[PDB]
Design an enzyme around this catalytic site. Structure first.
Site, PDB file in Angstrom:
ATOM      1  N   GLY A 290       0.784   6.011   0.248  1.00 30.74           N
ATOM      2  CA  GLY A 290       0.088   7.242   0.575  1.00 30.74           C
ATOM      3  C   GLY A 290       1.072   8.390   0.666  1.00 30.74           C
ATOM      4  O   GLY A 290       2.132   8.353   0.035  1.00 30.74           O
ATOM      5  N   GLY A 291       0.731   9.416   1.441  1.00 28.92           N
ATOM      6  CA  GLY A 291       1.634  10.544   1.590  1.00 28.92           C
ATOM      7  C   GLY A 291       2.872  10.095   2.345  1.00 28.92           C
ATOM      8  O   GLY A 291       3.966  10.652   2.187  1.00 28.92           O
TER       9      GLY A 291
ATOM     10  N   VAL B  14       4.892   1.077   0.666  1.00 25.46           N
ATOM     11  CA  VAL B  14       5.350  -0.062   1.453  1.00 25.46           C
ATOM     12  C   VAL B  14       5.178  -1.374   0.694  1.00 25.46           C
ATOM     13  O   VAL B  14       4.086  -1.681   0.212  1.00 25.46           O
ATOM     14  CB  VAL B  14       4.578  -0.143   2.785  1.00 25.46           C
TER      15      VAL B  14
ATOM     16  N   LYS C 147       9.703   0.029   3.360  1.00 27.50           N
ATOM     17  CA  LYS C 147       9.067   1.330   3.224  1.00 27.50           C
ATOM     18  C   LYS C 147       9.966   2.317   2.486  1.00 27.50           C
ATOM     19  O   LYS C 147      11.118   2.529   2.860  1.00 27.50           O
ATOM     20  CB  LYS C 147       8.725   1.868   4.614  1.00 27.50           C
TER      21      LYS C 147
ATOM     22  N   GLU D 194       9.830  -4.855  10.526  1.00 26.69           N
ATOM     23  CA  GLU D 194       9.477  -6.253  10.694  1.00 26.69           C
ATOM     24  C   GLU D 194       8.081  -6.438  10.113  1.00 26.69           C
ATOM     25  O   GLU D 194       7.313  -5.479  10.009  1.00 26.69           O
ATOM     26  CB  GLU D 194       9.468  -6.639  12.174  1.00 26.69           C
TER      27      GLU D 194
ATOM     28  N   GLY E  29       0.826  -1.195   0.000  1.00 26.15           N
ATOM     29  CA  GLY E  29       0.000   0.000   0.000  1.00 26.15           C
ATOM     30  C   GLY E  29       0.860   1.245   0.000  1.00 26.15           C
ATOM     31  O   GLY E  29       2.077   1.159   0.153  1.00 26.15           O
TER      32      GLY E  29
ATOM     33  N   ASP F 289      -0.696   9.743  15.585  1.00 28.90           N
ATOM     34  CA  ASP F 289      -1.623   9.302  14.546  1.00 28.90           C
ATOM     35  C   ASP F 289      -2.176   7.920  14.857  1.00 28.90           C
ATOM     36  O   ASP F 289      -2.325   7.083  13.973  1.00 28.90           O
ATOM     37  CB  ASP F 289      -0.954   9.312  13.167  1.00 28.90           C
TER      38      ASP F 289
ATOM     39  N   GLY G  53       4.504   7.520   1.868  1.00 28.80           N
ATOM     40  CA  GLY G  53       5.388   6.731   1.025  1.00 28.80           C
ATOM     41  C   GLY G  53       4.752   5.439   0.546  1.00 28.80           C
ATOM     42  O   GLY G  53       3.530   5.278   0.618  1.00 28.80           O
TER      43      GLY G  53
HETATM   44  O1  LIG Z   1       5.133   1.428   8.512  1.00 24.45           O
HETATM   45  C1  LIG Z   1       4.460   0.554   7.979  1.00 24.45           C
HETATM   46  C2  LIG Z   1       3.482   0.977   6.958  1.00 24.45           C
HETATM   47  C3  LIG Z   1       2.690   0.063   6.360  1.00 24.45           C
HETATM   48  N1  LIG Z   1       1.754   0.367   5.259  1.00 24.45           N
HETATM   49  C4  LIG Z   1       1.316   1.752   5.004  1.00 24.45           C
HETATM   50  C5  LIG Z   1       0.620   1.799   3.634  1.00 24.45           C
HETATM   51  O2  LIG Z   1      -0.488   0.902   3.625  1.00 24.45           O
HETATM   52  C6  LIG Z   1      -0.094  -0.446   3.874  1.00 24.45           C
HETATM   53  C7  LIG Z   1       0.591  -0.537   5.243  1.00 24.45           C
HETATM   54  O3  LIG Z   1       2.735  -1.247   6.719  1.00 24.45           O
HETATM   55  C8  LIG Z   1       3.641  -1.754   7.633  1.00 24.45           C
HETATM   56  C9  LIG Z   1       3.663  -3.123   7.895  1.00 24.45           C
HETATM   57  C10 LIG Z   1       2.665  -4.063   7.283  1.00 24.45           C
HETATM   58  C11 LIG Z   1       1.304  -3.676   7.180  1.00 24.45           C
HETATM   59  C12 LIG Z   1       0.349  -4.550   6.617  1.00 24.45           C
HETATM   60  C13 LIG Z   1       0.753  -5.821   6.154  1.00 24.45           C
HETATM   61  C14 LIG Z   1       2.106  -6.220   6.250  1.00 24.45           C
HETATM   62  C15 LIG Z   1       3.058  -5.342   6.814  1.00 24.45           C
HETATM   63  C16 LIG Z   1       4.635  -3.612   8.792  1.00 24.45           C
HETATM   64  C17 LIG Z   1       5.550  -2.746   9.416  1.00 24.45           C
HETATM   65  C18 LIG Z   1       5.505  -1.369   9.157  1.00 24.45           C
HETATM   66  C19 LIG Z   1       4.543  -0.880   8.257  1.00 24.45           C
END
Ligand SMILES: O=c1cc(N2CCOCC2)oc2c(-c3ccccc3)cccc12
Length: 269
Positions: A15-16, A20, A35, A85, A13, A131, A18
């Site tokens: 957004g603003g 991931v 990320k 992680e 996913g 947040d 960044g």
């Molecule tokens: O900082 C993070 C931002 C995100 N993202 C942000 C954008 O949308 C999707 C989730 O996800 C993270 C996950 C993660 C989330 C869902 C499924 C698998 C891993 C694990 C660790 C840190 C993050």
């Protein structure tokens, strides 16, 4: 060498904050989250400068806890790459709630309690998330443990006033909307108020600024008197009228919480 240590997977996913991606540390197949963040888009930098997320996560991470850990990070010409992680199987509280709707109070209690411990840890380490909400809460479906994620809008905890805010509006306190001023701990309790309500009702209580400054809480679902009480307490209009983390956990509704594993066995498996 980033491209050599981690094997990038599908886009999780963006957004603003960044983008991931899912991924695995070639070194041992450890599941991770990659990320990416463009420098041109960063608003707050910490100390060599780096994105807030890195500074904050470095202060908490160390040791076991309910906060996503920063495994490592890399700087690139126009962006930073963070290795977080990633627990599998996993699902964020948003999708979980959207799936099952209103959560039973027993489960809401276990979840809410874990978030409380997570947040207490952050503040305890000088970090303020800023947040807190269902999207930034991950559920380790097998162990029944919650993780706090994305400190992209966070900041170092301080006792003086905050005049900046880049979090989720519908989760922001009346003081922010009316005076663009708020204090860390108290604004955090308010968002926790929205969170608990979200969990037990299946949705957030306020959608417009009017509703937020009015602070009138209406329940569209059946919620116990005590839970309704803890919720309205966290959502007090006057910041100083809200409870302390200690007061919330000592609240009648917060007693006899289940263990993470128990929570998994009863509500997740
Ligand atoms: O900082 C993070 C931002 C995100 N993202 C942000 C954008 O949308 C999707 C989730 O996800 C993270 C996950 C993660 C989330 C869902 C499924 C698998 C891993 C694990 C660790 C840190 C993050």
């Amino acid at each position: 060498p980033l491209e050599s240590q981690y094997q990038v997977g599908p886009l999780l996913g963006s957004g603003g904050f960044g983008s991931v991606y899912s991924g695995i540390r070639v070194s041992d197949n450890l599941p991770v989250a990659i990320k990416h963040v463009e420098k041109d888009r960063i608003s707050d930098w910490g100390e060599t400068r780096v994105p807030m997320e890195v500074v904050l996560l470095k202060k908490v991470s160390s040791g076991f806890s309910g906060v996503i850990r920063l495994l490592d990070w890399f700087e690139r010409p126009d962006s930073f790459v963070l290795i977080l992680e990633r627990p599998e199987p996993v699902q964020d509280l948003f999708d979980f709630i959207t799936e099952r709707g209103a959560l039973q109070e027993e489960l809401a209690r276990s979840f809410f309690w874990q978030v409380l411990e997570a947040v207490r840890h952050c503040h305890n380490c000088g970090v303020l998330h800023r947040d807190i909400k269902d999207e930034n809460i991950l559920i380790d479906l097998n162990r029944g443990e919650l993780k706090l994620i994305d400190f992209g809008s966070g900041a170092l905890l301080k006792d003086t006033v905050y005049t900046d805010f880049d979090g989720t509006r519908v989760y922001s306190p009346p003081e922010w909307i009316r005076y663009h001023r708020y204090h860390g701990r108290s604004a955090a309790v308010w968002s926790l108020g929205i969170l608990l309500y979200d969990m037990v009702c299946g949705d957030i209580p306020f959608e417009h600024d009017e509703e937020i400054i009015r602070g009138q809480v209406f329940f569209r679902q059946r919620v116990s008197s005590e839970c309704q009480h803890l919720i309205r307490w966290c959502l007090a209009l006057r910041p100083s009228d809200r409870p302390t983390f200690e007061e919330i956990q000592n609240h009648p509704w917060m007693q006899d919480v289940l263990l993470p594993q128990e929570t998994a066995e009863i509500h997740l498996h």
